[PDB]
Amino acid sequence: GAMGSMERASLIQKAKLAEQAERYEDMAAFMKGAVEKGEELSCEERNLLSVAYKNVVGGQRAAWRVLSSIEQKSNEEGSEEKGPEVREYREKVETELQGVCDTVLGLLDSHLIKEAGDAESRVFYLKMKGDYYRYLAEVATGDDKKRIIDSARSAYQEAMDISKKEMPPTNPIRLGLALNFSVFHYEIANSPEEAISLAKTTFDEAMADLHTLSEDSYKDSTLIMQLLRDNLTLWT
Amino acid sequence: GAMGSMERASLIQKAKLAEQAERYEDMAAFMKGAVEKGEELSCEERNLLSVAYKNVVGGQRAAWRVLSSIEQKSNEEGSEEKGPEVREYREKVETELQGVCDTVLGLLDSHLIKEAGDAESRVFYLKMKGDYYRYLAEVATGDDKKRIIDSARSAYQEAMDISKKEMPPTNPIRLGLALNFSVFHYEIANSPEEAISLAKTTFDEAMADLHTLSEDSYKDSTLIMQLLRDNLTLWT
Amino acid sequence: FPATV
Amino acid sequence: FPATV
Ligand SMILES: N=C(N)c1cc(-c2cccc(NC(=O)C3(Oc4ccc(Cl)cc4)CCC(F)(F)CC3)c2)cs1
Numbered sequence: 001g002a003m004g005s006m007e008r009a010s011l012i013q014k015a016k017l018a019e020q021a022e023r024y025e026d027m028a029a030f031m032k033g034a035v036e037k038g039e040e041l042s043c044e045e046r047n048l049l050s051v052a053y054k055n056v057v058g059g060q061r062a063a064w065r066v067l068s069s070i071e072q073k074s075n076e077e078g079s080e081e082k083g084p085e086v087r088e089y090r091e092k093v094e095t096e097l098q099g100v101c102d103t104v105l106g107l108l109d110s111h112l113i114k115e116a117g118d119a120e121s122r123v124f125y126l127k128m129k130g131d132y133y134r135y136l137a138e139v140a141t142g143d144d145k146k147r148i149i150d151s152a153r154s155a156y157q158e159a160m161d162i163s164k165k166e167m168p169p170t171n172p173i174r175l176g177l178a179l180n181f182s183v184f185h186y187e188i189a190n191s192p193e194e195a196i197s198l199a200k201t202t203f204d205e206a207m208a209d210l211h212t213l214s215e216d217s218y219k220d221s222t223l224i225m226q227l228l229r230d231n232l233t234l235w236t
Numbered sequence: 237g238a239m240g241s242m243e244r245a246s247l248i249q250k251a252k253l254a255e256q257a258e259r260y261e262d263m264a265a266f267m268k269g270a271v272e273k274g275e276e277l278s279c280e281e282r283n284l285l286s287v288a289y290k291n292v293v294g295g296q297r298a299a300w301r302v303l304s305s306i307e308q309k310s311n312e313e314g315s316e317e318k319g320p321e322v323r324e325y326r327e328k329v330e331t332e333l334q335g336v337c338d339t340v341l342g343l344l345d346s347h348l349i350k351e352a353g354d355a356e357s358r359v360f361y362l363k364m365k366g367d368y369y370r371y372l373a374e375v376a377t378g379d380d381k382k383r384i385i386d387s388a389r390s391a392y393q394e395a396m397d398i399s400k401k402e403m404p405p406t407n408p409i410r411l412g413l414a415l416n417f418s419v420f421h422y423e424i425a426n427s428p429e430e431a432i433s434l435a436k437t438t439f440d441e442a443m444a445d446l447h448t449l450s451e452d453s454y455k456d457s458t459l460i461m462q463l464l465r466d467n468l469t470l471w472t
Numbered sequence: 473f474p475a476t477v
Numbered sequence: 478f479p480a481t482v
């Protein structure tokens with residue numbers, strides 16, 4: 001690691017600076033360096049890690065979608081052959097995306113998940129593991145696609161089981177996990193009914209627990225509840 | 237060059253795909269590969285090159301400005317010492333920006349400018365040369381700052397001299413050159429009166445030539461004229 | 473696309 | 478910042 005010579009605290013400081021500068025590739029590299037120091041991550045540090053890679057892979061995914069759409073059109077009945085370039089470049093972006101996902105999954109496997117004992121850390125990391133297998137699934141087409149899907153499902157399921165036992169229904173990590181696992185069902189697993197059921201049950205159980213929250217906790221929980229509702233409106 | 241094995245036409249095709257995907261670093265690398273094939277660039281190709289690097293360096297400049305602002309505040313009377321990290325990271329971004337500028341200036345010097353004989357190509361490239369020295373000037377602080385400023389000024393001046401002899405006053409390249417040279421005067425050369433004079437004279441001479449244009453040419457020229465007016469409104 | 477966080 | 482193109 002090229003961050004091996006930098007202090008852990010300096011890496012965290014520079015990750016925050018990179019965030020302010022919207023330099024998310026740098027932010028991700030700094031937080032990878034911090035993880036590789038071997039210490040567990042605090043709550044703030046876990047979110048710096050997740051924010052950085054979510055932005056990096058999110059940009060890759062958007063680019064992949066543009067290129068895949070162009071590629072499909074080049075393959076419709078009537079299209080003028082344009083050669084291998086669209087496929088090649090889509091493949092280039094795809095390989096870079098897979099590399100970022102493998103990097104994140106590698107950090108979770110070495111050794112963030114195995115040292116995560118508290119619900120807030122363990123659920124957070126297992127949600128990330130589901131998310132990055134889901135992004136691999138979005139581009140998968142080979143002998144491995146079912147196995148990638150099952151890896152996402154398995155990570156999400158373990159996170160769900162812990163979250164239901166150890167967190168209140170309004171916990172934003174629990175809510176975001178359910179939101180994303182619901183999207184997994186709809187978009188990856190061809191299970192729209194499961195997606196809708198999960199979003200609705202999550203929303204209703206959160207609604208019933210809002211009365212326990214402070215104003216600031218209420219704001220966070222209702223924001224993600226609104227995303228659940230948004231998806232349900234998209235799907236019904 | 238890692239693009240040495242790819243066809244020129246494939247590089248141009250992939251630059252256009254990268255643009256559609258908002259992958260401007262890739263776009264710039266593809267167009268650098270195309271320039272390094274050694275052939276002159278067509279009008280479309282010149283604009284692909286400029287669009288790519290303008291987006292890359294524009295993002296670097298925005299990040300540098302964020303970090304420089306944080307750094308200045310850390311140095312105000314009353315600030316808590318936070319160590320070398322803000323300076324280090326600003327320096328990192330600055331060095332990467334300088335590298336991109338040097339790359340573009342290198343392409344112009346080897347050998348785009350020397351082979352550019354038509355006004356539309358030669359003015360276009362000399363404007364780029366002024367622009368990328370201007371971006372170097374924005375971050376310069378050493379023994380070289382005056383010389384960087386004079387290099388920008390010299391490139392802009394040669395472009396201006398050609399444009400006034402060889403292009404109509406509504407030509408969008410001529411207009412954009414004047415817009416940017418005016419900004420150079422205001423922001424780099426500490427010559428706001430020159431900046432204002434140049435913008436106003438450029439605007440008025442363009443106004444008087446609009447009657448010669450088609451509807452589509454009119455649209456392009458008046459768009460950049462509006463940018464001249466916008467700056468004049470900012471400065472007066 | 474649907475919302476995720 | 479002022480406009481450039
Ligand atoms: N960016 C930075 N420098 C910093 C961010 C933080 C910080 C602090 C507290 C909470 C969070 N965030 C979250 O717990 C999650 O994200 C949320 C999203 C929306 C809402 Cl309304 C609430 C939470 C919950 C859902 C998710 F999917 F698991 C992802 C994490 C972050 C400290 S520093």
Ligand SMILES: N=C(N)c1cc(-c2cccc(NC(=O)C3(Oc4ccc(Cl)cc4)CCC(F)(F)CC3)c2)cs1
Nearest residue numbers: 255280283284287408409412413455456457459460482
């Ligand atoms: N992006 C792509 N794939 C493609 C772009 C083109 C193309 C085609 C014609 C003109 C231009 N552009 C310009 O001549 C400039 O830019 C303009 C900006 C605004 C306006 Cl209203 C008009 C022109 C003039 C000012 C400047 F500073 F010298 C920079 C060049 C580009 C073909 S393909």
